[PDB]
Structure formats: structure tokens, C-alpha cells
């Protein structure tokens, strides 16, 4: 009876595609053509945070827009003072193959995870004065690719076993499991309301999930290669992805389709990171060609280039207030731009 | 809370990072790769849901960090990028299983031509060579069924200065090597070099072979770093 179900699934996919085509009246470029452009954007390396031994795989800004945590593949987490380049903490990891790091919105916890399939939670605010592992979240059968805090007690972790999981930190158990993806899920982004989150997997598809419901609300299939990065538009009604086919794409939840592609014939390298400015007009993406690119989110033009890194730039993020942009790379250096 | 006191704390963190840098550069990291039929697990035991296994061993006061991968999915095109800038890749091949020896060639081809593994040398361990002779001395299974080019292959002038073994064993074991060096040569540049070896199940020279092979990988890294090439 598998053939009938496959035919019905194909019919449903055709219906969804027909609805998406019907909703498509005009492109985003057709609306933003008659608007003022952004112009050449020149950002300068205000700070350069050194100290990591091996390549930097991930970074995350604190909610105060001054503290940022970074993950290096030598088994080290460092919390920097971005204003003064000071080192606040240096947390050694049990496994040296960490691939993600998260800062709690309250600043009291930091999370990391890698090839060990375990999400370690570190308490930065301890009476003992040091930083200790408060909880290790085991239960994934694949490497951890991303993790983001919802609060001091809830966290969502992406994993290479094609599954995203919501965790309860005190109990250390998966209160919700998301099992829709086909390939390894490589990134996740939380909505501003923390009611939804998007995922990006190696199946060239992106899914919108409901945290409380636990079901896949929406699915986006614009890319043609593994999605390596994902980020939410500041208003929460759109999100941008970065994949290995050297293009960035803007999807909208309400439109249920793709609005623009941020690509160029010159760039032939995959996108490792993606981020939005405070207003959402600027789309910043990291590439394998050792430099980051600044994109006009509404006009799909190249506003500027961040070209100070000596190796693959793997992570990049904008502060909460939009003041600066921090980019990490495989050259073991973090650079802050303005 | 004086800011000058926060600078000294940061300076104290750098002192720990610099003394942790001495151990990182002095330690040689290795990645074990191989299938289930290969004796990869036996090689692990002969040195002295968790997604990674780490084995630490010393040869002539040199630290080696071997990283066996387990509890992962079948596809590996993403987590293999984490093993860039590594000293060497230990690839273990079951020579006896001629049926699955072809898929090992494709596994080696993908690793050797990987964009992020372009500068990493591979230490091939053709394991279970004792069972290879038994599968060719008996004559029940022959290579020519799978590889039509074995009939036109003859042993070169210098090969196998062993204390003693059957002539067809030498011709069989050097054809398996040949299929690997052609991949390492025709599908790769001179940045990284394959290091074929013949290993058994219980073999106590395996740690020495890795040490000698890693001494050569660093030697060519030093030659290019000092512009002596």
C-alpha cells in the first residue's frame, strides 16, 4: 500500500506548490525597485579578540551586547568583553570537538555541544566562583550542530541525527522531540516571541516548528544543497538561510515561499553563517572564501565586504542593539566591526 | 570593581591559554576511519550514545590523540570538516573481504579528494593480512572476478622481502596496494602523501608504524614551512 500513499503525497505536494504559485503576485524586487538604495558600506575592524588556539566554530552575543561567548575546536569556551577585549571566563570542555555555543538570555548559563552528542550546560554565576557543568543533556544519536536557550530552564538543540529536541534542564530530559527532517539538521533560529523556531538540514529544506505543540508547522524547499546557517528576521515573519550552493535565500512564514536569492556569479563558495542587522535591512553572511559579505536584504545588492579574515569565517553575529558585528573564523581570531 | 583588576584577570587567563598552547602543539591528533568489517576496533585495543571515542598513547615520549568515531549517522560529509588541520588520517581496510574491498576504494577516493582534507596525509592500514593469505592459498575466491585488471597485473621487480610467503600471496597483496596508490596519485596533488602498510590482527608494530609515518608527515610540513622545497 506504499504506492498509493506515495501518489497521495505527490498530489499533496503538487497542491502545496499550486497554492504557493497562486499566492505569488509580485516579487520583493518588484516592490523595492522604487526605493532608495543603501550605498557602499565600509565597516572597520574595531576590535580583534585573540587567544583561541584552534579554529573557532561558533560564537554568540549576550543580551547586554557587550559579552560574547566563543567556541573553539581545541576544547575551550571563552567569554569576551567586547568593549575592552578582556577575557571574562575560560571554560575547558570535556570534548574538544565542540561545534556550537549558546548564551542564555539572562547571562547566567552558557551551553555548548559537538561530536559527543551531549549538550553541556555551564553555570557562570556560582557561589564557588568558578564555572562548572550544571547539566549534560544526553539522548541524541548524532553530533550537535546548534543549540539556543529559551530561558534558564529550556533549551532547543539541533543534532546530526536528523532530530531537534526541546529539553528541560533540571530534569535533563527531552520534553519535546521534532522528527520531521531527513538529513542532518545544521542550524536553528528562535523567533523573537520564542513560540517558534526554524531549522536548516542537509536535505536542502527548512522547517518551521511549534515549541509547545511539537509539530512541523511549515516547510521551505528553496535551496539545492545543505543548509549551513539560518537566522530570523527581526519582526519574526521572515527568515534567511545560508547553504552550500553559494546562495542565500529569504523565506517568509506567511507567504510560505521564497522572496529573494542573494547570490553572485563571482562567489562559488558555500555560506557558513548568516545574520541580520537591527533594522533587518542588512544581511551579513560568512563564506568559505575567507571574507564576509554585506547584502541589501530588500535590493539583493552587495553593500560591502568584510575582508579581514585569513581563513574560513565560520560564525558571525550582530548585537542585540545592532551596534556591532562579531565574526569568527578558522584562523582562530574574532573580529568586531562597526 | 576597578577595570584595572579586570585587565589583570584577563592577563591571568592568557597565561593559562599559553601554557595550554604548549600541550596542543606538542600533541599529535589522529582520526581513525574504517568500516565495521575492518579491524578498526582491534587496532584501538592494541594501543596503550557517545558520539566520539578518544584513545591516548605514547611512542618515544610523543603524545598521540586518536579519535575513533562512533554513534554517528552513515553520512559524514559534515562532521568530517571538524577533522581539518589534523596530523594524519588512519584508514583501515579489510583486505580479505573482496566483495566490500571495492566500496573501501570509493571511501578512500572521497576522503582523499575532500576539499577540507586536501592537506592531510593518510596512513593506510590494510588489516587482516593473515586472513588474506588464507583466502588466496585456498583459491576458493579470486580477485579477478571483481577486478578484471588483475589478470594483466604482474608483481614489480622489488616487492615483499618477507622471511617467507607464497608467491601468489605477494601478487595479491600488492594489487590491493596498487588500487590505493593510483587513487592517492591520480586523484591528488603533492600536498599530502598516502602511507600504505600491511597489518595483522595481533600486531605490536602498529604503534611504531604510526610514529614513523607521522614523523614523515611533519617533516614535509617543516620543509614547506621553512621554504625548503
Amino acid at each position, epitope marked *: 500500500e506504499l504506492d498509493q500513499l506515495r501518489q497521495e503525497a505527490e498530489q499533496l505536494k503538487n497542491q502545496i506548490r499550486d497554492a504557493r504559485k497562486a499566492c505569488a503576485d509580485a516579487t520583493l524586487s518588484q516592490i523595492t525597485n522604487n526605493i532608495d538604495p543603501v550605498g557602499r558600506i565600509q565597516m572597520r575592524t574595531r576590535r580583534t579578540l585573540r587567544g583561541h588556539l584552534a579554529k573557532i566554530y561558533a560564537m554568540h552575543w549576550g543580551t547586554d551586547s557587550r559579552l560574547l561567548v566563543s567556541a573553539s575546536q581545541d576544547g575551550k569556551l571563552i567569554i569576551w*568583553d567586547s568593549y575592552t577585549t578582556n577575557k571574562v571566563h575560560a571554560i575547558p570542555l570535556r570534548s574538544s570537538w565542540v561545534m556550537t555555543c549558546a548564551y542564555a538570555p539572562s*547571562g547566567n548559563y552558557v551551553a555548548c555541544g559537538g561530536l559527543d552528542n551531549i549538550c553541556s550546560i555551564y553555570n557562570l554565576k556560582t*557561589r*564557588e566562583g568558578n564555572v562548572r557543568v550544571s547539566r549534560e543533556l544526553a539522548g541524541h544519536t548524532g553530533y550537535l550542530s546548534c543549540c539556543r536557550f529559551l530561558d534558564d530552564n529550556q533549551i532547543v538543540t539541533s543534532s546530526g541525527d536528523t532530530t531537534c529536541a526541546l529539553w528541560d534542564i533540571e530534569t535533563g530530559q527531552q520534553t519535546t522531540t521534532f522528527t520531521g527532517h531527513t538529513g542532518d539538521v545544521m542550524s536553528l533560529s528562535l523567533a523573537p516571541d520564542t513560540r517558534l523556531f526554524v531549522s536548516g538540514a542537509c536535505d536542502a529544506s527548512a522547517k518551521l516548528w511549534d515549541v509547545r505543540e511539537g509539530m512541523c508547522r511549515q516547510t521551505f524547499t528553496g535551496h539545492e544543497s545543505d543548509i549551513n546557517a539560518i537566522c530570523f528576521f527581526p519582526n519574526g515573519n521572515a527568515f534567511a538561510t545560508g547553504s552550500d550552493d553559494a546562495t542565500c535565500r529569504l523565506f517568509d512564514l506567511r507567504a510560505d515561499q521564497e522572496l529573494m536569492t542573494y547570490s553572485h556569479d563571482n562567489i562559488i563558495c558555500g555560506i557558513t553563517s548568516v545574520s541580520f542587522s537591527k533594522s533587518g535591512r542588512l544581511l551579513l553572511a560568512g563564506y568559505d572564501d575567507f571574507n564576509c559579505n554585506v547584502w541589501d536584504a530588500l535590493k539583493a545588492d552587495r553593500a560591502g565586504v568584510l575582508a579581514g579574515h585569513d581563513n574560513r569565517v565560520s560564525c558571525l553575529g550582530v548585537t542585540d542593539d545592532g551596534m556591532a558585528v562579531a565574526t569568527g573564523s578558522w584562523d582562530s581570531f574574532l573580529k568586531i566591526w562597526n | *570593581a*576597578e*577595570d584595572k*583588576a579586570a585587565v*589583570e584577570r584577563s592577563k*591571568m587567563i592568557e597565561k593559562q591559554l599559553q601554557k595550554d598552547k604548549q600541550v596542543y602543539r606538542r600533541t599529535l591528533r589522529l582520526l581513525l576511519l574504517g568500516a565495521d568489517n575492518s579491524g578498526k576496533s582491534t587496532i584501538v585495543k592494541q594501543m596503550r550514545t557517545s558520539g566520539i571515542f578518544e584513545t591516548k598513547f605514547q611512542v618515544d615520549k610523543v603524545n598521540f590523540h586518536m579519535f575513533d568515531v562512533g554513534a554517528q549517522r552513515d553520512e559524514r560529509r559534515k562532521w568530517i570538516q571538524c577533522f581539518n588541520d589534523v596530523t594524519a588520517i588512519i584508514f583501515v581496510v579489510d583486505s580479505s573481504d573482496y566483495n566490500r574491498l571495492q566500496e573501501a576504494l570509493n571511501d578512500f577516493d572521497s576522503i582523499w579528494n575532500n576539499r577540507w582534507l586536501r592537506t592531510i596525509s593518510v596512513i593506510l592500514f590494510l588489516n587482516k593480512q593473515d586472513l588474506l593469505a588464507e583466502k588466496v592459498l585456498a583459491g576458493k575466491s579470486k580477485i579477478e572476478d571483481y577486478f578484471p585488471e588483475f589478470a594483466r597485473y604482474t608483481t614489480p621487480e622489488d616487492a615483499t622481502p618477507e622471511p617467507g610467503e607464497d608467491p601468489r600471496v605477494t601478487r595479491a597483496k600488492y594489487f590491493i596496494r596498487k588500487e590505493f596508490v593510483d587513487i592517492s596519485t591520480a586523484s591528488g596533488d603533492g600536498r599530502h602523501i598516502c602511507y600504505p602498510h600491511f597489518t595483522c590482527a595481533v600486531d605490536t608494530e602498529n604503534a611504531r608504524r604510526i610514529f614513523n609515518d607521522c614523523k614523515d608527515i611533519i617533516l614535509q610540513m617543516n620543509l614547506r614551512e621553512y621554504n625548503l622545497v
Partner: single-chain antibody
């Protein structure tokens, strides 16, 4: 977290003695340590300070060259060697935990105290010295400084301490606006650059004691006279 300190007794006006503090329950090597003396029926006075790593060391002008502070990270012990012990060196010497990074709360833990009896600087002034009040009524302690404690970077280095009768000083407000951990929301601090106010919403039985003000803009760290609350 614990800081048990030994050494004391009666010392002659020409003798010497060593004060030691045994730390336990926390990473001693990652913290800076202070010595604070409290003369009988008088206020607090900072004595010395050793940073994390036995690097930067500061002394008070009245003990500089006469006192010396030493650290022992492996044993989690901090020592204070006094060479000459004058008559005015009789007080209870407190040991204070201290850590310094962005967002940290120094002077957050104090030792139980050890007594020793012997047979320009910023002036922090507390206008009042005794304020009687009944429980449930809101009071407001005020303080002043010689110059502005508001630094250029944007934070005011004013610290609030409470010494309950028979108890060690306890941090309530650090940097003039941040509530310390383990203390109720009722306490709060205010001020602009030179006049600072500490106000408690609902006075309780455990809020009775002497309230001290401290500045950390630059060494030496100077305390206030002390404003006792009665009931």
C-alpha cells in the same frame, strides 16, 4: 563558601603576629582578597589587598611598610604579617572575598572575624549615625563623597554593607545600583555622582544594624562612619 580565620590574642605594643584565613568551598585562587579592620564601637577601615595571582598588592597608608600580605593558593590560605603593632592597631580584622570581571560583585562574602588586642583619600561621609524606626516603615540612608564616584566608563563605584549585631558585614548593593545575591528586593540604592541614597521598603527584624558605605573608584578604599538602625 566559607572563610575561617585564625590568629589573635593579646600582643605587646612592640610585638608581631601573623593572621591567617582558611578558605573553603570556593575557588580561592580565582578571587582577590582584602583585609578589613573594625575598631571597637567604630566603623570599618580597609587594610590591604592581594589580587588573584599574588600580583597587584595594595596597602593602607597607616599600615604600609608595617604590614605585609601573603598568599598560598595550594592550601587556600591567606596570611597577613604585621611587623610593628601600635596601640591603635586593636580591632577585628575581617577577610573579604573579591572577584573582578565585567558584571562581577566584589566584596560579596566576608569572614567571621578575628580579634587582635594590643595593650588625597576620598572622604565618604554619612550624615546620620543613628536612625530609630519601627518595622514596616521605609527609611533612607544617605551618603556623600569628596569627588564624583561616577567614572568615565559609566559605572559609579559605591558599595553598601550591613553589619547585623554580632554578625560580619554583608554586601547589599554593589556599584550603587546592583542588588547583591541572597538579599531581598526591598533594599535599593540610588545617586547621581556624589550623593547616594540607600532605601529599604519594609523594615524588618533582620534589617537592624549599622549600614556602611564604601567606594572602589581608586585605592585606598574608604568606608563611612556608620549609620545604625534601631527599633
Amino acid at each position: 563558601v566559607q572563610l575561617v580565620e585564625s590568629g589573635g590574642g593579646l600582643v605587646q605594643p612592640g610585638g608581631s603576629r601573623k593572621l591567617s584565613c582558611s578558605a573553603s568551598g570556593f575557588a580561592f585562587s580565582s578571587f582577590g582578597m582584602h583585609w578589613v579592620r573594625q575598631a571597637p564601637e567604630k566603623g570599618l577601615e580597609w587594610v590591604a589587598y592581594i589580587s588573584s595571582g599574588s600580583g597587584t598588592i595594595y596597602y593602607a597608608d597607616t599600615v604600609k611598610g608595617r604590614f605585609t600580605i601573603s598568599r598560598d593558593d595550594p592550601k587556600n590560605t591567606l596570611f597577613l604579617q604585621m611587623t610593628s603593632l601600635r596601640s591603635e592597631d586593636t580591632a577585628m580584622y575581617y577577610c573579604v572575598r573579591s572577584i573582578y570581571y565585567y558584571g562581577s560583585s566584589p566584596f560579596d562574602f566576608w569572614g567571621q572575624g578575628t580579634t587582635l588586642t594590643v595593650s588625597s583619600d576620598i572622604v565618604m561621609t554619612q550624615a546620620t549615625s543613628s536612625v530609630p524606626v519601627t518595622p514596616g516603615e521605609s527609611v533612607s540612608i544617605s551618603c556623600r563623597s569628596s569627588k564624583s564616584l561616577l567614572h568615565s566608563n559609566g559605572n559609579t563605584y559605591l558599595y553598601w554593607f550591613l553589619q547585623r549585631p554580632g554578625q560580619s558585614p554583608q554586601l547589599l548593593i554593589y556599584r550603587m545600583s546592583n542588588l547583591a545575591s541572597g538579599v531581598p528586593d526591598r533594599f535599593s540604592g540610588s545617586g547621581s555622582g556624589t550623593a547616594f541614597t540607600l532605601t529599604i521598603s519594609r523594615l524588618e527584624a533582620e534589617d537592624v544594624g549599622v549600614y556602611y558605605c564604601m567606594q572602589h573608584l581608586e585605592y585606598p578604599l574608604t568606608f563611612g562612619a556608620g549609620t545604625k538602625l534601631e527599633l
